[PDB]
Design a protein around this nucleic acid. Structure first.
Ligand SMILES: [Mg+2]
Ligand SMILES: [Mg+2]
Ligand SMILES: [Mg+2]
Ligand SMILES: [Mg+2]
Ligand SMILES: [Mg+2]
Ligand SMILES: [Mg+2]
Ligand SMILES: [Mg+2]
Ligand SMILES: [Mg+2]
Ligand SMILES: [Mg+2]
Ligand SMILES: [Mg+2]
Ligand SMILES: [Mg+2]
Ligand SMILES: [Mg+2]
Ligand SMILES: [Mg+2]
Ligand SMILES: [Mg+2]
Ligand SMILES: [Mg+2]
Ligand SMILES: [Mg+2]
Ligand SMILES: [Mg+2]
Ligand SMILES: [Mg+2]
Ligand SMILES: [Mg+2]
Ligand SMILES: [Mg+2]
Ligand SMILES: [Mg+2]
Ligand SMILES: [Mg+2]
Ligand SMILES: [Mg+2]
Ligand SMILES: [Mg+2]
Ligand SMILES: [Mg+2]
Ligand SMILES: [Mg+2]
Ligand SMILES: [Mg+2]
Ligand SMILES: [Mg+2]
Ligand SMILES: [Mg+2]
Ligand SMILES: [Mg+2]
Ligand SMILES: [Mg+2]
Ligand SMILES: [Mg+2]
Ligand SMILES: [Mg+2]
Ligand SMILES: [Mg+2]
Ligand SMILES: [Mg+2]
Ligand SMILES: [Mg+2]
Ligand SMILES: [Mg+2]
Ligand SMILES: [Mg+2]
Ligand SMILES: [Mg+2]
Ligand SMILES: [Mg+2]
Ligand SMILES: [Mg+2]
Ligand SMILES: [Mg+2]
Ligand SMILES: [Mg+2]
Ligand SMILES: [Mg+2]
Ligand SMILES: [Mg+2]
Ligand SMILES: [Mg+2]
Ligand SMILES: [Mg+2]
Ligand SMILES: [Mg+2]
Ligand SMILES: [Mg+2]
Ligand SMILES: [Mg+2]
Ligand SMILES: [Mg+2]
Ligand SMILES: [Mg+2]
Ligand SMILES: [Mg+2]
Ligand SMILES: [Mg+2]
Ligand SMILES: [Mg+2]
Ligand SMILES: [Mg+2]
Ligand SMILES: [Mg+2]
Ligand SMILES: [Mg+2]
Ligand SMILES: [Mg+2]
Ligand SMILES: [Mg+2]
Ligand SMILES: [Mg+2]
Ligand SMILES: [Mg+2]
Ligand SMILES: [Mg+2]
Ligand SMILES: [Mg+2]
Ligand SMILES: [Mg+2]
Ligand SMILES: [Mg+2]
Ligand SMILES: [Mg+2]
Ligand SMILES: [Mg+2]
Ligand SMILES: [Mg+2]
Ligand SMILES: [Mg+2]
Ligand SMILES: [Mg+2]
Ligand SMILES: [Mg+2]
Ligand SMILES: [Mg+2]
Ligand SMILES: [Mg+2]
Ligand SMILES: [Mg+2]
Ligand SMILES: [Mg+2]
Ligand SMILES: [Mg+2]
Ligand SMILES: [Mg+2]
Ligand SMILES: [Mg+2]
Ligand SMILES: [Mg+2]
Ligand SMILES: [Mg+2]
Ligand SMILES: [Mg+2]
Ligand SMILES: [Mg+2]
Ligand SMILES: [Mg+2]
Ligand SMILES: [Mg+2]
Ligand SMILES: [Mg+2]
Ligand SMILES: [Mg+2]
Ligand SMILES: [Mg+2]
Ligand SMILES: [Mg+2]
Ligand SMILES: [Mg+2]
Ligand SMILES: [Mg+2]
Ligand SMILES: [Mg+2]
Ligand SMILES: [Mg+2]
Ligand SMILES: [Mg+2]
Ligand SMILES: [Mg+2]
Ligand SMILES: [Mg+2]
Ligand SMILES: [Mg+2]
Ligand SMILES: [Mg+2]
Ligand SMILES: [Mg+2]
Ligand SMILES: [Mg+2]
Ligand SMILES: [Mg+2]
Ligand SMILES: [Mg+2]
Ligand SMILES: [Mg+2]
Ligand SMILES: [Mg+2]
Lengths: 46, 10
RNA sequence: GGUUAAGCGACUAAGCGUACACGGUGGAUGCCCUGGCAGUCAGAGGCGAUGAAGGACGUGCUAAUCUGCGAUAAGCGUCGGUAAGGUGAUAUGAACCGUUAUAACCGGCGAUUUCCGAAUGGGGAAACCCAGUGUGUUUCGACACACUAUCAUUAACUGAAUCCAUAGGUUAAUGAGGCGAACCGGGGGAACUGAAACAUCUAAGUACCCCGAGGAAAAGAAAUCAACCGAGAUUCCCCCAGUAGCGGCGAGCGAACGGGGAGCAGCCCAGAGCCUGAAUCAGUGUGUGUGUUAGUGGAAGCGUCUGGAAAGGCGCGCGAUACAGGGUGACAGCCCCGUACACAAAAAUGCACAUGCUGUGAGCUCGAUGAGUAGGGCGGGACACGUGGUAUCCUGUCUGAAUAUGGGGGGACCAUCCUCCAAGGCUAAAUACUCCUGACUGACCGAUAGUGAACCAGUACCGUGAGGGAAAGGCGAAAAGAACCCCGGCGAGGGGAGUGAAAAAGAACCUGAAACCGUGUACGUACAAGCAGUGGGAGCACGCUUAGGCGUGUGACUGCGUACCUUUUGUAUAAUGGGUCAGCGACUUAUAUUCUGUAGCAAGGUUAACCGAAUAGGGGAGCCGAAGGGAAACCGAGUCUUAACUGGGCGUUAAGUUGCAGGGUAUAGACCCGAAACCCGGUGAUCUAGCCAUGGGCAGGUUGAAGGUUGGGUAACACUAACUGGAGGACCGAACCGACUAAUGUUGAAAAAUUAGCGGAUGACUUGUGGCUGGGGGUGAAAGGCCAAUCAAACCGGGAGAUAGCU
RNA sequence: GUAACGGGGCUAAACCAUGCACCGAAGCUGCGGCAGCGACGCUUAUGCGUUGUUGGGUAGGGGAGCGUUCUGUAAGCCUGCGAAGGUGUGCUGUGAGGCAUGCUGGAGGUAUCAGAAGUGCGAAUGCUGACAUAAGUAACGAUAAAGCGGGUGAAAAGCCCGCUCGCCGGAAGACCAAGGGUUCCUGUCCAACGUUAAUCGGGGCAGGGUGAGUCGACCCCUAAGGCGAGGCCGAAAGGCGUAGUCGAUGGGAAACAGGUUAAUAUUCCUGUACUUGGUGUUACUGCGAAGGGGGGACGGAGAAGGCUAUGUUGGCCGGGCGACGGUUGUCCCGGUUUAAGCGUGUAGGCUGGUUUUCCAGGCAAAUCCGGAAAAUCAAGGCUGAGGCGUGAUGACGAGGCACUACGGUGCUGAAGCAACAAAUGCCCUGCUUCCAGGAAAAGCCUCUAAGCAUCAGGUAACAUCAAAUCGUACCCCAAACCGACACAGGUGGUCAGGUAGAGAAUACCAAGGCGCUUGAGAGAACUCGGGUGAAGGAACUAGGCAAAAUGGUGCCGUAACUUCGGGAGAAGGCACGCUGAUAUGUAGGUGAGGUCCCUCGCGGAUGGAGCUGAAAUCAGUCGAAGAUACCAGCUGGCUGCAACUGUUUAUUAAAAACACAGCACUGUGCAAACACGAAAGUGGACGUAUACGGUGUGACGCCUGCCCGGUGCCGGAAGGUUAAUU
RNA sequence: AAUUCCUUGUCGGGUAAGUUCCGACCUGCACGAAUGGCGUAAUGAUGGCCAGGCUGUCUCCACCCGAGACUCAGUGAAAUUGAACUCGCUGUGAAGAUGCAGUGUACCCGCGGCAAGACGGAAAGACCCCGUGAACCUUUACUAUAGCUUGACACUGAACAU
RNA sequence: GUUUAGAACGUCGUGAGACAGUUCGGUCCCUAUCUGCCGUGGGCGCUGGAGAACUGAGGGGGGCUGCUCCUAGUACGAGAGGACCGGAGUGGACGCAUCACUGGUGUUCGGGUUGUCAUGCCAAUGGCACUGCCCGGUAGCUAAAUGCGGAAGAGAUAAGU
């Protein structure tokens, strides 16, 4: 039965990619929080 | 997670 | 003695119980710290288009990762320090480099510095895609550099409607872009909560969002306070004072004057001269001084004993401006590193003084004296002050002066008197904070603690995402990490051997507990009923004693005896809690107040901030007490009440105050754990709902509309017949889609399915790939449905330890 | 279950009335011990033959202690002659405890008196870790099915090989996209992983493997949409949006066949092609846009016709003469394959064609497009399957002989045709028809402006360069993706064999791929999935739930009612096999040879061979049964509700609910109302009352009566009342 | 009557027997005309009722085929659990006893079965109540407010007519 | 049925909603540890060991009844009618055993037949299609099939004589 997760690389990068996140300050604030937390992977982009 | 059934008298 | 009879009769343990012994599992306890926590004293408070923060990919004798570094890639140059050893780590090895100064290492200064990222040539799903121009290369295929973002400012050139112009346009110069902890200013600005509800109020101008700046920021040089005496910018601390006041006068909020301290600094414009480059400030060079960024030297012990090892024991010394610490085979002043002291800079840089240039103007005289402003009306806000009698401040709105012969303020207002001069600006110090650097400290932690992280931790892992987020330390002095032999599958595992003080330290490695699970021994147990024990007690086993019998284990048999906690009038209760063990886990902290105890001083007691070589001392600013009464003015051992009290009320003989401890109270989360929710900022339409764009799919078999043709009929039609036609949210029925019934399954095969049937199946169909709508919002052929397994208000983070008269 | 003495039992062992005994409590008394308190004797902060008396206890109040960690004491003391810790034992105090010791361990520990607390745990469905219980019980994941021999190995039900059996075969096969990321191949290993074992594996380890001018991506082009210079708006942040710039799921140049690896192939190799640019040469020369025009370029449904894929048969070639009756035969088996490209332009589709002339149009111009006229031609042009030729004396090819590691390798290699059937593929982006009226842009073609017209540039022919970069293994309806799993689930596209059948249903098979990762026995109850059933036939049950039954084609026949379409497959009935005949294989379809005709070809007309081939009738024949299996409607009658197809509570409700066409009311004059937005703006709508929004009703038929007091709404405005303001 | 309380109204039809169904009655507790009324062919995994066919639905189950259950080998859970040396009866008792009293019965221990009890397991009860709990929703509850609307002033000036 | 969320009617309410008014639709989980119960074993005991056959303390099962006939058309009764007691026969329900008979089943026997595949082909067979679909059917199991049972008789009694 179809579940909530249907993989799509193009959709995934357009939704949560580095350039999509950095387009707005709110997403840029996510990067600032993840940089402050020290995340190994800042965004979802490969 | 889960759910319950009130078959008991009202 | 044999044969019968009757009575009694231990010895059995499949197993189990108790005790003990020996193990296994497990990692508690103890010991340990290259990790954390809280601070002290300093420094440093930014980085970035000269391309940051943060990454991607590369880079070694290198397979991975870490740490460095960037195609010059664990590095290159130069200048110093230092050097006999050295090529970062896991992590050996290999191949080598050095050894008296070009090994290596450290520091200063440079060079290089891929890609992404403000990212800036364009684009983009970050680490990728695609160029243009110009210079220079040529092997005529190409190649190498450089430039080309935007905005602001300035200057040129051109350049509309439209004649000049202006807008606009093209160049060229500068500047800005981003990142970062807290502190700061400003623009916005909650709710939970408290008020035992709840509107004003509180929470709170807090949380949060946004903008900007600095190492501090802000504020700041009286249209200020005072009160007829005076003070003299701002900021900060202790008082004043929980006072005056504010307040559904409830909850609560809460000054100022003044005083004691820290630190002090004043100026410029609103204009012209006479003087003149005066003082002062800023640039810069030029030295000195003092730092910073590598470093140098640095005292003094032997013998003997135990022991694997001596730093320990026992002797006898020595140094100390060094007995701070660390390491060394157990506890080291004299073993090592250091420490106390004494020194050091080629180069870079801070700070301070001096000095030289470049700006900068000092002084004197005469003027001038901040107008849509003050004020007012209206609506709000800020002042402790909630409109109140409400001054003062800010203004959305509507008005609107005087202007030194004049205005402002002195908490309604007027007069008088004091005080000051708004409507232009600048200003160090005392103050706040710590992402970061160095040193040091702790009646701070010691692996369930301390940062989430002592370990390759913001990792593994979870979630579409925001985001959430772990577990995991210890062999030994030295790996000497067990050659060799044996069993085994050329295993695993084990037995020897060997190493070591010890393997009862063997890498599943310090110590190794308990629950739990085994082997052995002693005793009990197969006619015996229940919180399983207790009182009595034989027998057996065993240890002492000498026969006095005690001690230990077990325990036939027997009297008595229905767990614990919580909550209750009351529980064996068939009321709640708990499978067990270990670890952790709840009345604290700050301030104020009252009371008690205790200590000191005493009609006095005591300081706070601050000063201070500083737990001393100074500082008595203040605070409490020795006098009360009254609403108050006032009076006073009295006073109030009243016209007045013989009165009556409250007082007058009675020691307090400051510490320390403790009992309460108060504000903070306030003994701990737990809501459903409210508010703020974000993340989600990869599921689903609707819509948008662009594609796809629907076997086969029926029914046979309109229309058309040809006849028959009509004046022509109409009508009628036949034949063509192929209409439909048409029919039957696969794919596809739906999900009506039943069975199964419900610790599922599956957190919604399977099997047999069932409905639709050319359409309001179905489906792929993209896109859009976001939380009081979406979307909904409408069920309060759906919006990432969550929906009568999603998820995540924050307010937040909301609150919880309840358990 | 006696159950109304606790039981036994009792005629006193009951009751009544007198006694004297005895039993009976932690009460009382003795004999010790501890503590509190009161007034004393001496002495008294201490204490004494003290003495008297008290000492159940929750909430709670008061008082006194133990122990733990840390600081001072302590540079002391304890300690390698064994510290802490752990584990035994003994002693001791009223208690929390203390002391000492044996063993373990191997380095710390700490008196005393004070000081400070993360200072004492059994509970909180407490938290973390460890370990029990149920328990060797349930389960080991579709009932598609396995068996044997051999091999390897320490070991084989599970691996390898072989021979059978069974399952799928519109999938359970093959190829992809998306997604995954090495799972691919080889070697090696069996700890863990695999629900068992495992020699095996999608496990561990080590190597190898992904080759492109033509396939994709990238690139050019745009859709929805996103971003967005300036700009507009907004406390800030920001929002919207122009020029622009992105964004495929769409539009744009070109490659086929054969061979080859353990794993790659339209990528490598062989053979044969093609495309777009660059450069050069030569010839002829009007070029040219950020411009115009054309083109690209488009619906649904339906109908055929022409074809191919493909299949069948025959012929041909090769092989077979049959384990058991027959089988030299009209027998059996197998093969009979060949692309892109190039040439021809066919069936067929579309359009009249060719000149000259004019013109306020296509933002200017235009020779192009669109217009106006005139002339002349009976044609011309465009598009397009397929076939045929060439590609191809090649490749491939059954099989063959030699070698060799079961592989293989090398060589050779016959026929390689026809007829018929036939798509959902192609012609077809066509044709016909319908209303709901069916992208864009660029590439491409053409036209001229400005700017060049010696040049440049364009056209044509050769030669030549260049075609980069990235993806390419493997899974891809699943053990590799989404579901925590090697999960009876989900997941888009392409391919579509034989027999029967209308069919992609279904059954049996081919190619191909599998037997679903625990088995072996036993053959109880009971449960699940099924089979059959005497007699009765809904008596069952809320209810014919379920099951059983019906089921096909042809023909006959078919009611009430009706909106005339229906109802209707109404109901109900009849015929179905095989063989022969009609007619040895018919009607029909297809159609060669031959014979005429051609302004000549992929031609036309005849012609009928040969293939293919129903349906019907008659006769015969077998069985209980011929729509024989699978497959495949139960029917009728009355009635409520809703007209109907549809939609809905993903995951207990599919309905009478919602929607619905229709109807009515009402708002709305377009800078519309309204809605989303602090606003700009957007939707409404590039629509204009024959429109749009809202509301209620809910096809159709017949109809929809009375009330304006109340509450709303609309209209009026004289009077009463009434804000800011003055 | 999807509406009728009394009520299974009354009558008729259907059955052997009909509280349902169908037809009427009207006494409409408490129908009623676009919150539409009445009819209506067709349609319906629509509701009720009846008939035929059909049958293990049933009288009344029997047998058979498979998959489990059972035995062996291998692997190997779970919910739960204060501790148990865990019998019946009657009585008592936080008032329904394996555990108390009395009394009866019972050798020790597995395996296959059935579920009467252990107030069995699951989940801090959804009903009821309470808290000066929460949330949504309604309205002529309160207090506000967006929006809409009124006027004054400002943006906003100059002639004429009543 | 009642008793959730959907929907509707009547009714109440301005309304959300409400109604022991009504209508339609609507998830019933648990692998048995203990007690209990039905079966079936292991262990040990019962005094040498072992193999048998018993006694019966005790416990359980079983215990129903119709209708005809004879007595007798007698007693009784005017008649209509019509027995007690006692003795036969035949049923119902229930129970047990059994499969000879009557039957069911008999996917392990035989045959028929459809579609398709294979055995080279024909013929003859086999596989698969629910055992392909069917027709029969041995043994066994089985009821609807057929045997049997309930007692009589004693002992002590209840109410009653
Ligand atoms: Mg220590
Ligand atoms: Mg409150
Ligand atoms: Mg600075
Ligand atoms: Mg030195
Ligand atoms: Mg002034
Ligand atoms: Mg004013
Ligand atoms: Mg005001
Ligand atoms: Mg007043
Ligand atoms: Mg007031
Ligand atoms: Mg005021
Ligand atoms: Mg640990
Ligand atoms: Mg150890
Ligand atoms: Mg005994
Ligand atoms: Mg006892
Ligand atoms: Mg307790
Ligand atoms: Mg209990
Ligand atoms: Mg419990
Ligand atoms: Mg005191
Ligand atoms: Mg002092
Ligand atoms: Mg004083
Ligand atoms: Mg007095
Ligand atoms: Mg206190
Ligand atoms: Mg407190
Ligand atoms: Mg239809
Ligand atoms: Mg239909
Ligand atoms: Mg649906
Ligand atoms: Mg079920
Ligand atoms: Mg799951
Ligand atoms: Mg259909
Ligand atoms: Mg909604
Ligand atoms: Mg509802
Ligand atoms: Mg959901
Ligand atoms: Mg809410
Ligand atoms: Mg949150
Ligand atoms: Mg708060
Ligand atoms: Mg809380
Ligand atoms: Mg006595
Ligand atoms: Mg006493
Ligand atoms: Mg210490
Ligand atoms: Mg000891
Ligand atoms: Mg040691
Ligand atoms: Mg504690
Ligand atoms: Mg087992
Ligand atoms: Mg069990
Ligand atoms: Mg089993
Ligand atoms: Mg399986
Ligand atoms: Mg084998
Ligand atoms: Mg098959
Ligand atoms: Mg791998
Ligand atoms: Mg493989
Ligand atoms: Mg093994
Ligand atoms: Mg592998
Ligand atoms: Mg190539
Ligand atoms: Mg490539
Ligand atoms: Mg292509
Ligand atoms: Mg925009
Ligand atoms: Mg802009
Ligand atoms: Mg595309
Ligand atoms: Mg069309
Ligand atoms: Mg063909
Ligand atoms: Mg023969
Ligand atoms: Mg033609
Ligand atoms: Mg491939
Ligand atoms: Mg492959
Ligand atoms: Mg998975
Ligand atoms: Mg699918
Ligand atoms: Mg059957
Ligand atoms: Mg029958
Ligand atoms: Mg029959
Ligand atoms: Mg019945
Ligand atoms: Mg049915
Ligand atoms: Mg009909
Ligand atoms: Mg009815
Ligand atoms: Mg549902
Ligand atoms: Mg449903
Ligand atoms: Mg309606
Ligand atoms: Mg009226
Ligand atoms: Mg009205
Ligand atoms: Mg009724
Ligand atoms: Mg009747
Ligand atoms: Mg009726
Ligand atoms: Mg009505
Ligand atoms: Mg109406
Ligand atoms: Mg119906
Ligand atoms: Mg019937
Ligand atoms: Mg069976
Ligand atoms: Mg467990
Ligand atoms: Mg029990
Ligand atoms: Mg009882
Ligand atoms: Mg059992
Ligand atoms: Mg049961
Ligand atoms: Mg109340
Ligand atoms: Mg019901
Ligand atoms: Mg039901
Ligand atoms: Mg059910
Ligand atoms: Mg049940
Ligand atoms: Mg027999
Ligand atoms: Mg049979
Ligand atoms: Mg054959
Ligand atoms: Mg079969
Ligand atoms: Mg028979
Ligand atoms: Mg008798
Ligand atoms: Mg007798
Ligand atoms: Mg008697």
């Amino acid at each position: 039965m179809k579940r909530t997760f249907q993989p799509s690389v193009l959709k995934r990068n357009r939704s949560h990619g580095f350039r999509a996140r950095m387009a707005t300050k709110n997403g840029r604030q996510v990067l600032a929080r993840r940089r402050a937390k020290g995340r190994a992977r800042l965004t979802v982009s490969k | 997670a889960a759910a319950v059934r009130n078959a008991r008298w009202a």
